[PDB]
Amino acid sequence: ELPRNLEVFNEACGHVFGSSFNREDNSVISDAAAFLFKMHTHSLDGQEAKVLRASEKKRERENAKKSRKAPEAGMRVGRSLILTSRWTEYCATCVPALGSKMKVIKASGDAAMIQMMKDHNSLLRVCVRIEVWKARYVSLVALDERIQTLEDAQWFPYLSGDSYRACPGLVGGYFAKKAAAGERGKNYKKLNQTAIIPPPRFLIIGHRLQIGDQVTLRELLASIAWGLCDGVLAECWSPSQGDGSIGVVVGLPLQATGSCFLVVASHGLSAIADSRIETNLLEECIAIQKQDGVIKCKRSGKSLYHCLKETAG
Amino acid sequence: ELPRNLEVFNEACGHVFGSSFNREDNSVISDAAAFLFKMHTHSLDGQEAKVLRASEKKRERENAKKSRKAPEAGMRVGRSLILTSRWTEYCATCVPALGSKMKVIKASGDAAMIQMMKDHNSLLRVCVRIEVWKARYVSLVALDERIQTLEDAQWFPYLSGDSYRACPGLVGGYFAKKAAAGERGKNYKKLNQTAIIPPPRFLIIGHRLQIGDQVTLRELLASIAWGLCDGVLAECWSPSQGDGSIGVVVGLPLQATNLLEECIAIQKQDGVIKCKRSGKSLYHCLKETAG
Amino acid sequence: SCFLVVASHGLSAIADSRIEG
DNA sequence: AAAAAA
DNA sequence: AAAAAAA
């Protein structure tokens, strides 16, 4: 019915949050995923201290975290998430010990522990994807003070190192910058800043985002883009009968990833750093694939965040 | 009556892959060449360990590779290649011992050992040529993650160090960059990203690419250029009656407001003609013309 | 506020949406 | 084409 | 828009 990843995430969130975990609210799913990501990265109080090569100023914080009491049952998480009495057992049983590595577990040969580590990795990936989607969603109506120029905006979203390790191709930030600057191996993955990520309520169900889905404008935009993307992407949405709140998806952008506009010099020709520039920018178009067929829509020339702000005024 | 260069490759492919080796498929030939190259570079499981100056992680990787079980007969390599029972004998008798240098082979004077080393080197060259052609073919529709600017694109294809050591004039990548960023001399070879490599199905039989031979658009484009080359090169191909994804070569480029008026020289059946550039890379043109 | 428009889906980046012209 | 040889 | 590595 469901792949291993989504089944693992559903089991984990159910075990940790009882009946309080709503399966149809994006905010609740994002909060649950954030808490689970903290639990599986040993970022909660009372978990192992990260000291392997930590600096003394970091060992101070790690020792403070270890000494601090672990979360108690019934604690309020986010807005409408409540920890069950059996969350400690789940944390002790389903979270690999700090520093666990797949090679060591495989050398052990225990099938149960191998499966546990596989579930841990899949859960980390799912939680990081939900985190990236929520970062886009927040950026749709809340500018990041850090992003002031195009160079800053190039490395969105600014998520932690664990996020980058889980999903290097979707997570930007300091570690994506470091990977790009440093040596690039065969495993190097570039930051796909506008990759399509289904809403959390769709991601945990396994339903791929497609034409016809009954989604809100903000969540669709968070799926296909983020705040500083061009406003023309709003053409991928259409309000339903009677307006209300939830509309429908009429199309999806093309070239969401893998856009290169280089032309190397060859056979006596001259190199081109950008085919597009080689010149009004506002005349550019995006190929939106609809059910009927692909249509080229003229760019708005304005940010998605500012379009949403203007339409909400 | 093929050259020894191609005869060695054909014999090795036969011995190692039985009847599963189809000589009319570019993908199958590329898979076979990759397997033979990793066999002759001591990169398969169960082969000697590259532990002359390996670092801790590299030492561990090489020791694990040696300890791991070697490939066995019937193994599936790619999509349509199956190893035969004779591949162990071929690896034992034709692949030189790890670290073997031609100096010592010549000093010994054994004619058979000299012939084996020469065949090994020729096979490495052929395999690397096929690897470069397949890299071009892949890049025609999917660009390497390392290529973001022209400086990065200047070093395509990004192949391994052994590949560069075998074909310095065709292979790019990290070792080509290092050679450029170091000393230069007579032995130094310049990377030619658009050197004409015939398709493997033609290369292994010695057939030189020429006007009028049936090919596919991607085949010709990979043979004479790669993805980020200008799209005007697509004019070197013309579809046949009904197309069917198979056409014919009509020309081969030479030299293998005004910026977009630059022209390339195409040698046609009549003579050299000047064709205006398109301005878009072959990758972008193929993406836009796919539908 | 910020008036940037990052490059996406084949569009070119804009350093300022207002200055465009 | 022969030689060299992270 | 699979899996194996892994401040």
Numbering used by the authors:
A (entry chain D): 34 to 311, 316 to 350
B (entry chain C): 34 to 289, 316 to 350
C (entry chain E): 292 to 312
Report text from the authors:
The viral nucleoprotein (NP), a key component of the replication machinery, packages the viral genome into protective ribonucleoprotein particles. Although TiLV-NP is considerably smaller than its influenza counterpart and unrelated in sequence, it maintains the same topology and domain organisation. This comprises a head and body domain between which is a positively charged groove, where single-stranded RNA binds. In addition, an oligomerisation loop inserts into a hydrophobic pocket in the neighbouring NP, the flexible hinges of which allow variable orientation of adjacent NPs.
